[PDB]
Amino acid sequence: STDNAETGVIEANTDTDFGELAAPGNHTNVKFLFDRSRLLNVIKVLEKD
């Protein structure tokens, strides 16, 4: 469709050209994604100052 991407801010499915508006079905949320353990480093154990 008509647009001008050189300007940067482009407009915004199949309802625009031919539509389909598949219903929603939030696993990408920032708060949710980053809450899970992961290894960081392995270190020795001291036995004196």
Partner 1 sequence: TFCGPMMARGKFLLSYSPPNGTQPQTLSEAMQCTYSIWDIGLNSSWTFVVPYISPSDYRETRAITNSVYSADGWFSLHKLTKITLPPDCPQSPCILFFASAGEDYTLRLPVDCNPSYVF
Partner 2 sequence: RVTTQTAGNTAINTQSSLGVLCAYVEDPTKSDPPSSSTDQPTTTFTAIDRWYTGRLNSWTKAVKTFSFQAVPLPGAFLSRQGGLNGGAFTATLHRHFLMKCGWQVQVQCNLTQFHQGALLVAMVPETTLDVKPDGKAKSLQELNEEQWVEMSDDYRTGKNMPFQSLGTYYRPPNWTWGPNFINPYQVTVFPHQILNARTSTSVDINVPYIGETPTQSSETQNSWTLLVMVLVPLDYKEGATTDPEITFSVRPTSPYFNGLRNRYTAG
Amino acid identity of 7?
A: T
Binding of partner 1 at residue 47 (CB under 8 A)? Answer: no
Site string for its own copies, 8-47 (x = CB under 8 A): ----------------------------xxxx-xxxx---
DSSP string of 30-49?
A: HHHHT-S----------S--
* CB within 8 Å of 16: residues ≥ 6 apart: 1
Q: Taking the complex as a whole, how short is the minimal distance between the CB of residue 46 and its own copies, in angstroms?
A: 14
Contact with partner 2 (CB under 8 A) among 3, 9, 37, 48: 9
Amino acid identity of 48?
A: K
Task: Write out the binding residues for partner 1, residues 15-34 only, by CB under 8 A.
Answer: 16-18, 20-22, 24-25, 27-28, 33
